[PDB]
Amino acid sequence: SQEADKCPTLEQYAMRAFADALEVIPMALAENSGMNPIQTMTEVRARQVKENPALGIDCLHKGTNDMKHQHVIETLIGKKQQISLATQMVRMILKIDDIRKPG
Amino acid sequence: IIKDQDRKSRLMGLEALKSHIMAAKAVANTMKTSLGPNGLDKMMVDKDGDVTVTNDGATILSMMDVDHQIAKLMVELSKSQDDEIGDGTTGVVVLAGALLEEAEQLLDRGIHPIRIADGYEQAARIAIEHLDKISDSVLKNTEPLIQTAKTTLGSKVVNSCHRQMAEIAVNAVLTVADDVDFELIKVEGKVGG
Amino acid sequence: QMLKEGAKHFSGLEEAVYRNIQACKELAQTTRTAYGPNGMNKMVINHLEKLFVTNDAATILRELEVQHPAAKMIVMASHMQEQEVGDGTNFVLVFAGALLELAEELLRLGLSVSEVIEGYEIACKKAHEILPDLVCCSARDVDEVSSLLHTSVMSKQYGNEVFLAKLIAQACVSIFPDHFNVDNIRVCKILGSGVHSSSVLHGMVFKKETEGDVTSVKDAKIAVYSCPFDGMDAQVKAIADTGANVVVTGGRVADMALHYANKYNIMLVRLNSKWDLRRLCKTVGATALPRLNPPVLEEMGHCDSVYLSEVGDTQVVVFKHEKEGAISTIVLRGSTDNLMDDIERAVDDGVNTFKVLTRDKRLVPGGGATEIELAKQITSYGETCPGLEQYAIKKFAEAFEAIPRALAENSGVKANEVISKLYAVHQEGNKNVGLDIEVPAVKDMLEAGVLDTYLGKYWAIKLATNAAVTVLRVDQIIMAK
């Protein structure tokens, strides 16, 4: 989001939207946990900027808490690759504006 | 005259965008429910009358009647994610949808498709730049390893003894480690006990 | 009850006239576009999903699905005209329609159909008398030959090489025209390179089948066979004793008959059409030897050149340089099958036109010139012939005005203006005056070169006339379902 601002052009709104799409994963956690996705992100985004990103969403205690302490770590390749794959595919489809399929 | 015969489907203009949006968003919303330890399981009963209670997206999409091209694509994302590392087969699915869910917005604003890919590309390239920044490079560290393994054996049927599975995983990888080769690891499976 | 059974479409008097005339008009106008260098080809595709891109009216009608009685009469007019000289195939069509059109208008007024025919028939004989007097006799003579061949090559897709197709057809029809016959001309459509590569081979070309055999035989002793070479030694051995270094079998040849003919250094060719065998017997002097036991040395024709050329990348035997080669072969070359098709279609025409010369030197300045003249003459003739016929005669001529009308039509030039001008300048510049499409304006066809065959026009008027007349008489015809 902040980098989207440091770089104008129509790509600005794009980066912003991209970021908004990076909040779904968390929002979903709160969703599947039972807690209101919105009210959750409320405490998240807040407790996150204050105590570094080392804090996430504890679907077990319903709320925010330091993940590093809850021992909820995940390889970098997991997230890393995740963004990639999803990004690459979605991109392809975006370039698809016509499909003639006979039979 | 008749360019395309019958039994087809031609998506032109915003028709192509829309279709994919509603088609993917849906498939993305389906898996999204099975995300996290609280993930909601699904039952995929094909036409043979066989039950399929799985929590993995790839296992759900591999049994879901996917006729739309867009949906099939989402099926190749979880399959690819599941054929490489496997873990998070759900994420990629939900993630892909979200992005598209947002994209549609920019589209209805008059923003051309190609452009949307651009921003999402630069942003992603930076998304990693940051994720690779906050990371805390793990240490032959017996402590962290056994931990990471337990974060993969959780919310599963092997969670009741994720400790034993992780222990074996660590030693197995540490032994054949030299750059670690997954081939030097023989997984013998037999009934009993 | 019902006068006639079921499924029997009938038409009486005018009712029939309108239908017949109408159907003929649309059919005559359809091909009308295929006239002059502005000829707009058409794409007809039969059941077998076959695409035919031709400018020749006859080829069009003989490929179109016509079920209309009167309309079929037009297919006949174009058929005969195509069998007579070829050129003017569309001429008859359009004209035939115009006639019916002018005639129908006469009936609706109250005029008797009888008089119509009489007036038209009488004017048909008058014209056949005017043409021979006005015609411009030309000089054989390679100089005059190329002139007529040069005016018969244009108006087509191969107009880019009207100079080559002119000399090619000028050489062929000038090597064996005793009394020339369009059947002694074999045209081959070989793909590869532009038409500017077309060659003239003094003989007959085909495709051999054996390699080890003599690809280029000198004074060959051709032996045309028709009986299969299957069983093979005594058959091929009896061919080496006669001295036949070139075997042209009609049917298939056994592999053992090929290896033997391949060992005797005898160039063997299997799968030879029945016509290619006859053309090889009248070019080298070979005898159609049925069985493989009766052949001798007096049954072998002489062919000084029988080599294997791979022009365009396809093997072809060239039996050229004979004692009395009565049949030559036109080696056509095209970059595409499309261009190759059009070219050949026009080549044949020129072959017929040349055949018209060998039996008619006379020629007229085409492009509508002759038409306008006849119209002028015939019209005046009508005024000299009293009676209601004076109207029919003048109407007949008014039809000839449809030819130049179509000319300026396929060019986008206001007929009303070009016609009026044409006549005026024609009544002063005489016969020669015509219409030059390349440059919308009156011009001397004789000077422009545009010269058509007298005989080509002659038949046209007669055939078209008699035909149209017939379709007009049968004004009542149910059927018998």
Place this chain on the structure above:
Amino acid sequence: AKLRAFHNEALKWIGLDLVNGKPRDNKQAGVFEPTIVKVKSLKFATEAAITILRIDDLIKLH
């Protein structure tokens, strides 16, 4: 079309003489109209467009 070619060859004084039907020298012919007419013609016609293009919606009601 012919007018354009003859309009940039024999200068301005080249218009269409409907009477004859060919690009003729109206200046030499005598065909002259007070420039004021041309001005008003354009001015009015122009303003006429701008207005209609300035219309996105209206309300006449019966």
Place this chain on the structure above:
Amino acid sequence: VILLKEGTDSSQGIPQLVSNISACQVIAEAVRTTLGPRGMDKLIVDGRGKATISNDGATILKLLDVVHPAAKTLVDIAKSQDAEVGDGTTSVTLLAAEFLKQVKPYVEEGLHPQIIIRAFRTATQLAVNKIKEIAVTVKEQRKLLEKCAMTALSSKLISQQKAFFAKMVVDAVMMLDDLLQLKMIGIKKVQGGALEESQLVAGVAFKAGFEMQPKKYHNPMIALLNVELELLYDKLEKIHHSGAKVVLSKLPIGDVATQYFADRDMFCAGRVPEEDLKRTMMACGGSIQTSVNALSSDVLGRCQVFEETQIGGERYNFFTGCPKAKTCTIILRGGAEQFMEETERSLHDAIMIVRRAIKNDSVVAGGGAIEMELSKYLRDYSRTIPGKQQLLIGAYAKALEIIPRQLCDNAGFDATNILNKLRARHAQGGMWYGVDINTEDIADNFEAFVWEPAMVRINALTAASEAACLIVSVDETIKNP
């Protein structure tokens, strides 16, 4: 009664041109998006599932269910464009359709078809000529060629290392430089590592023989075998008695068979794909044998280096250093398939440009730079060429503005602002000013190093233009069901 049966839909006059024009325009539009570096791919499905992602018009028009006459013609044009120069397939298909869009507003008014052909044919000629008068003839030289490579990779995902890749392209093109046959330069994409690892192999490389076998053997004596090496010792002995120290069995190799292979010191891989088997044949120069007993000394190819490295954990064999490596393999390494995929696409094109550089010298400013100029001059010639041709030629020039128009659209930039911004900068700078889509703004191609063979534009104009003339000429469509 009734000319044609209930099925012979007769479209004459104008209702024929129109229909054929509209469809052609729409078909072209379909591919009109696959134009440019960021084209819009099309996942063509064959009803049976198999989805094909293509960006080339030809491949697309050949995999689509075409059932329209005027439509099947477009497929021909694309095929005639793809088999002539290659790229521009989508262009020629779009232009031909567009040329039918600018004439339509004239037909509906009464503009005769033939006349229309005149201008169009006259314009194309005038345009083609200019291509030979405004074409910049450039120079070989590893220095220049490398430049022509960086310009082919720039403004792309590979631009990050276009410096290294550009070199590989030049060398790969220099090595096998005997009119460079793209069907000899292989590209091997394998995920694992970084683009900074990709190298150019003087032969081929495939994706073992035994754990620790001769990883890097000096001069190998390639021994290819189609049959499997399983039931054994009899076959292995035959390979040793031939001098074959390197064998590649297409099918799996016996467990024990592999043993005697590590004893006789002979590298031998099992389960070698058919395609790969052939590659090695065109690489080191080894002959493919089905049986192990048919393997002789004259069947053992030769290479300089043969190493087995684990590029990404998976051991890979390399076949570099061929006497006459007339079939190289560009080994590519990267993080994901995507990145690697794009890479295989950037290099592919890069090789093209470097190729056309050694061949045709006369080039031009791409990015629709030539179009903008042509459209300019053509408009001028309009004034010089009065009458019907005038207005037409102008519209013809207006059409050529579609190449740059859609060019910007295939990225997300406003076509208007750029088009106008181009005509301005073009009429001030030179015939080099085009549209750098990668930057969404005008720029000089001479400096932007954006060039393309003079042939390209030429092969497109004629072919594309003449096509329209066809649909225009044929003023009637009959089939006869």
